[PDB]
Write an enzyme that holds these catalytic residues in place. Structure first.
Site, PDB file in Angstrom:
ATOM      1  N   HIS A  30       0.890  -1.151   0.000  1.00 47.26           N
ATOM      2  CA  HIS A  30       0.000   0.000   0.000  1.00 47.26           C
ATOM      3  C   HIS A  30       0.941   1.217   0.000  1.00 47.26           C
ATOM      4  O   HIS A  30       1.468   1.591   1.050  1.00 47.26           O
ATOM      5  CB  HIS A  30      -0.857  -0.012   1.263  1.00 47.26           C
ATOM      6  CG  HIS A  30      -1.856   1.092   1.312  1.00 47.26           C
ATOM      7  ND1 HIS A  30      -3.110   0.976   0.761  1.00 47.26           N
ATOM      8  CD2 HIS A  30      -1.764   2.357   1.783  1.00 47.26           C
ATOM      9  CE1 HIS A  30      -3.750   2.127   0.885  1.00 47.26           C
ATOM     10  NE2 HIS A  30      -2.957   2.983   1.502  1.00 47.26           N
ATOM     11  N   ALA A  31       1.166   1.791  -1.183  1.00 45.97           N
ATOM     12  CA  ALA A  31       2.060   2.934  -1.378  1.00 45.97           C
ATOM     13  C   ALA A  31       2.288   3.776  -0.137  1.00 45.97           C
ATOM     14  O   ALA A  31       1.340   4.111   0.569  1.00 45.97           O
ATOM     15  CB  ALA A  31       1.530   3.826  -2.528  1.00 45.97           C
TER      16      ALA A  31
ATOM     17  N   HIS B 292       1.753  12.141  -4.933  1.00 47.20           N
ATOM     18  CA  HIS B 292       1.319  12.203  -3.536  1.00 47.20           C
ATOM     19  C   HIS B 292       2.492  11.796  -2.662  1.00 47.20           C
ATOM     20  O   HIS B 292       2.954  12.582  -1.830  1.00 47.20           O
ATOM     21  CB  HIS B 292       0.161  11.256  -3.253  1.00 47.20           C
ATOM     22  CG  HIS B 292      -0.297  11.288  -1.831  1.00 47.20           C
ATOM     23  ND1 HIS B 292      -1.424  11.972  -1.431  1.00 47.20           N
ATOM     24  CD2 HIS B 292       0.248  10.766  -0.703  1.00 47.20           C
ATOM     25  CE1 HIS B 292      -1.553  11.872  -0.118  1.00 47.20           C
ATOM     26  NE2 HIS B 292      -0.550  11.147   0.347  1.00 47.20           N
ATOM     27  N   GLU B 293       2.974  10.568  -2.864  1.00 46.24           N
ATOM     28  CA  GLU B 293       4.089  10.064  -2.086  1.00 46.24           C
ATOM     29  C   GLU B 293       5.265  11.036  -2.123  1.00 46.24           C
ATOM     30  O   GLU B 293       5.840  11.352  -1.080  1.00 46.24           O
ATOM     31  CB  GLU B 293       4.526   8.689  -2.599  1.00 46.24           C
ATOM     32  CG  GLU B 293       3.467   7.609  -2.504  1.00 46.24           C
ATOM     33  CD  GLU B 293       2.865   7.466  -1.109  1.00 46.24           C
ATOM     34  OE1 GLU B 293       3.586   7.690  -0.117  1.00 46.24           O
ATOM     35  OE2 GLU B 293       1.668   7.109  -1.001  1.00 46.24           O
TER      36      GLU B 293
ATOM     37  N   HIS C  34       5.147  13.606   0.354  1.00 49.38           N
ATOM     38  CA  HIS C  34       5.674  13.250   1.657  1.00 49.38           C
ATOM     39  C   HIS C  34       7.200  13.429   1.667  1.00 49.38           C
ATOM     40  O   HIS C  34       7.772  14.004   2.602  1.00 49.38           O
ATOM     41  CB  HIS C  34       5.316  11.800   1.995  1.00 49.38           C
ATOM     42  CG  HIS C  34       3.861  11.582   2.282  1.00 49.38           C
ATOM     43  ND1 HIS C  34       3.175  12.301   3.239  1.00 49.38           N
ATOM     44  CD2 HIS C  34       2.974  10.690   1.778  1.00 49.38           C
ATOM     45  CE1 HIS C  34       1.932  11.858   3.316  1.00 49.38           C
ATOM     46  NE2 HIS C  34       1.783  10.880   2.441  1.00 49.38           N
TER      47      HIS C  34
ATOM     48  N   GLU D 132      -0.391  14.986   3.871  1.00 51.42           N
ATOM     49  CA  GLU D 132      -1.079  14.340   2.761  1.00 51.42           C
ATOM     50  C   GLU D 132      -1.287  15.284   1.564  1.00 51.42           C
ATOM     51  O   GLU D 132      -1.144  14.870   0.419  1.00 51.42           O
ATOM     52  CB  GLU D 132      -2.442  13.827   3.213  1.00 51.42           C
ATOM     53  CG  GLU D 132      -2.413  12.860   4.379  1.00 51.42           C
ATOM     54  CD  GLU D 132      -1.499  11.676   4.147  1.00 51.42           C
ATOM     55  OE1 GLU D 132      -1.565  11.060   3.072  1.00 51.42           O
ATOM     56  OE2 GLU D 132      -0.723  11.348   5.055  1.00 51.42           O
TER      57      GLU D 132
ATOM     58  N   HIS E 261      -6.079   1.421   6.254  1.00 48.33           N
ATOM     59  CA  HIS E 261      -5.862   2.299   7.400  1.00 48.33           C
ATOM     60  C   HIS E 261      -6.551   1.862   8.695  1.00 48.33           C
ATOM     61  O   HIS E 261      -6.119   2.247   9.792  1.00 48.33           O
ATOM     62  CB  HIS E 261      -6.284   3.722   7.058  1.00 48.33           C
ATOM     63  CG  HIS E 261      -5.612   4.264   5.836  1.00 48.33           C
ATOM     64  ND1 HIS E 261      -5.863   3.777   4.572  1.00 48.33           N
ATOM     65  CD2 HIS E 261      -4.685   5.240   5.685  1.00 48.33           C
ATOM     66  CE1 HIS E 261      -5.121   4.428   3.696  1.00 48.33           C
ATOM     67  NE2 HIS E 261      -4.397   5.321   4.344  1.00 48.33           N
TER      68      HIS E 261
ATOM     69  N   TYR F  45      -6.785  12.792   5.714  1.00 47.51           N
ATOM     70  CA  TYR F  45      -7.120  12.843   4.305  1.00 47.51           C
ATOM     71  C   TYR F  45      -8.215  13.837   4.027  1.00 47.51           C
ATOM     72  O   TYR F  45      -8.181  14.543   3.010  1.00 47.51           O
ATOM     73  CB  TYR F  45      -7.536  11.468   3.841  1.00 47.51           C
ATOM     74  CG  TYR F  45      -6.427  10.497   4.038  1.00 47.51           C
ATOM     75  CD1 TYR F  45      -5.342  10.472   3.161  1.00 47.51           C
ATOM     76  CD2 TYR F  45      -6.414   9.647   5.151  1.00 47.51           C
ATOM     77  CE1 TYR F  45      -4.263   9.618   3.386  1.00 47.51           C
ATOM     78  CE2 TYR F  45      -5.343   8.800   5.391  1.00 47.51           C
ATOM     79  CZ  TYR F  45      -4.272   8.787   4.505  1.00 47.51           C
ATOM     80  OH  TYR F  45      -3.227   7.941   4.733  1.00 47.51           O
TER      81      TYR F  45
HETATM   82 ZN   LIG Z   1      -0.144   9.974   2.269  1.00 45.01          ZN
END
Ligand SMILES: [Zn+2]
Length: 598
Positions: free
Chosen positions: A315-316, A345-346, A349, A373, A475, A485
């Site tokens: 899960h990325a 997205h990643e 981070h 996020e 999650h 989120y």
């Molecule tokens: Zn995230």
């Protein structure tokens, strides 16, 4: 009577130590073996004692009356233990019941609906591919029933002990329950109400999409399958959790004759690979005068799904190793449009980790979980625009028509707007548990009536209190707060709105610059704001982090709306032209069993 010297030395030790914990968590989530699990929980256990032992040392330094509050902020921060306030026996038991859920989720496997011999399809490639391309309601239901029974039901015990422990650890740190524990992260006693008001404001917009999406499905799948006025049978929504519906835009978009931006096929024909996607993702950031991915990233990252029979967590996700330049992402990347957004997205981070390395360990985190996020999501909004996708050749010939515009906002609606209520219920559900508001006998229905209440969605098949569905969502199984989120989808549009303005892309008046077509790619002033913000790293309450970005200091939903405005005034009219039913009556999908055999 300083304590600065003590915190400096301390953070350095915490950082040195969390690095060792991160390496085990990483080794484990890359190769799920019992050994790695044991070691993993072992590091966390040693650290937990060091934390307690440091929790009692601060009794020395009486910070609750110090001078400079930067230093006094750090103490309130470190003294605040999480599951570590828990006594040794419980903590190892938490690490455990937790480990049981996490591994259970990642090891799920089901058999093809068309080959009871295979039984080796996982949630990442195979299953999620089916729920997204199949238009056979029977087959979709099959994969739904199979995945929920394994990922959810199979772990009600762990989950129950968790809630009981999660609550215990909460009261040991002076919180009413884990529910208010997570909320402390937003540092605002009226955050839940703020989040209730914005949802209230967009809710009307949500149902102009809902009813409409329900108007095509019942037209496509049929009366017997999808009913009018009834909640939408999830599993027809293209997403296992129906948290996002863009995957079914081929049978639900406003104008099927006009273009539907789905760059997946072109990426594929163009020889696109995960690496290339990561490089593109890296250019966007450097283009904004932002930090480039360090050498440790390309060496220590896993951007493709392992080819050995290994079991891993795919899960990325993005990892901060707490040193200098040791940032890596673990993702089972596939060459599709959704993945390209996820990559960014990643990377979001990763930008954040890099932006605030220099900060004292305690501050090497985001200003409130929401900002973390959103970062990458603001960029993904730009690479989703016909504008930027044309500039990189991923969109051949495209004409903005006018109704081709309605097929873009609406798409972003089946992603950005649809989600808001889904993400809200996730924690709204876990909150009501953390807070003893629900009785064990009503745990599975409290979940669905809540998915019903806010999203107008229901299971494809009947479920009862014998089943336990909340865990089918990563999650929920992995103990990851979710409210993040929801705030991220709110405040990411505020960031994006300003970023596009700080660039010459968005002008509320200039009609040739619609807020849904600004690229911000290669924008120095945009990255510069992203720098004033990200570099702060939880060193200040989130209102200041935001202020540093655009001078505003309040969370609001004016952004999304102003973005989807042309779309909103297209449904209230279209839904009356097709005579579409708004709202839905309560669900009948949760009960307590019934059989046709003695
Ligand atoms: Zn995230």
């Amino acid at each position: 009577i300083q304590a600065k010297e003590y915190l400096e030395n301390l953070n350095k030790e915490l950082a040195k130590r969390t690095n060792v914990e991160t390496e085990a968590a990483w080794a484990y989530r890359s190769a799920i073996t019992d050994e790695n699990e044991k070691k993993k929980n072992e590091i966390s256990a040693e650290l937990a004692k060091f934390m307690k032992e440091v929790a009692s040392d601060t009794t020395k330094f009486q910070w609750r009356s110090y001078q400079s509050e930067d230093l006094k902020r750090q103490f309130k921060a470190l003294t605040k233990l999480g599951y570590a306030a828990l006594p040794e026996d419980d903590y190892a038991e938490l690490l455990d019941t937790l480990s049981a859920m996490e591994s259970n989720f990642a090891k799920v496997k089901v058999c093809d609906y068309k080959d009871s011999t295979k039984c080796d399809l996982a949630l990442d490639p195979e299953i999620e591919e089916v729920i997204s391309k199949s238009r056979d309601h029977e087959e979709l239901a099959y994969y739904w029933r199979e995945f929920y029974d394994k990922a959810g039901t199979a772990v009600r015990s762990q989950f129950e002990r968790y809630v009981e422990l999660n609550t215990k650890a909460a009261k040991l740190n002076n919180f009413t329950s884990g529910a208010e524990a997570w909320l402390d992260e937003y540092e605002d006693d009226t955050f839940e109400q703020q989040l209730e008001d914005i949802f209230a404001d967009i809710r009307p917009l949500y149902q102009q999409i809902h009813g409409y999406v329900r108007f095509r499905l019942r037209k496509h799948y049929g009366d017997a399958v999808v009913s009018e006025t009834g909640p939408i049978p999830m599993h027809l929504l293209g997403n296992m959790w129906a948290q996002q519906w863009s995957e079914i835009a081929d049978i639900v978009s406003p104008f099927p004759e006009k273009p539907l931006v789905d760059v997946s096929a072109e990426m594929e024909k163009q020889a696109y690979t995960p690496l290339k996607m990561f490089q593109m993702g890296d250019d966007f950031f450097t283009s904004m005068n932002l930090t480039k991915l360090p050498q440790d990233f390309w060496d220590k990252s896993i951007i493709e799904k392992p080819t050995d029979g290994r079991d891993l967590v795919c899960h990325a996700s993005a990892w901060d190793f707490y040193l200098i330049d040791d940032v890596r992402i673990k993702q089972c990347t596939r060459v599709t449009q959704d993945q390209l957004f996820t990559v960014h997205h990643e990377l979001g981070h990763i930008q954040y980790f890099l932006q605030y390395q220099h900060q004292p360990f305690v501050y090497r985190t985001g200003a409130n979980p929401g900002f973390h996020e959103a970062v990458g999501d603001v960029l993904s909004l730009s690479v989703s625009t016909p504008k930027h996708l044309e500039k990189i050749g991923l969109l051949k010939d495209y004409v903005r028509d006018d109704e081709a515009r309605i097929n873009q906002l609406f798409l972003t609606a089946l992603d950005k707007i649809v989600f808001l209520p889904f993400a809200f219920t996730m924690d709204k559900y876990r909150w009501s548990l953390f807070r003893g508001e629900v009785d064990k006998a009503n745990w599975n229905c409290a979940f669905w009536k809540l998915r019903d209440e806010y999203s107008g969605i229901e299971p494809p098949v009947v479920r009862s209190e014998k089943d336990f569905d909340a865990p089918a969502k990563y999650h929920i199984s992995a103990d990851v707060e979710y409210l993040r989120y929801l705030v991220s989808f709110i405040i990411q549009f505020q960031f994006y709105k300003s970023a596009c303005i700080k660039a010459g892309q968005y002008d509320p008046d200039n009609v040739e610059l619609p807020l849904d077509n600004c690229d911000i790619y290669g924008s120095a002033r945009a990255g510069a704001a992203f720098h004033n913000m990200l570099s702060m790293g939880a060193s200040k309450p989130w209102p200041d982090a935001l202020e540093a970005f655009n001078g505003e200091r309040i969370m609001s939903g004016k952004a999304i709306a102003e973005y989807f405005e042309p779309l909103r005034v297209w449904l209230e009219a279209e839904n009356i032209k097709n005579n579409v039913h708004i709202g839905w009556i309560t669900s009948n999908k949760c009960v307590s069993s019934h059989h046709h055999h003695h």
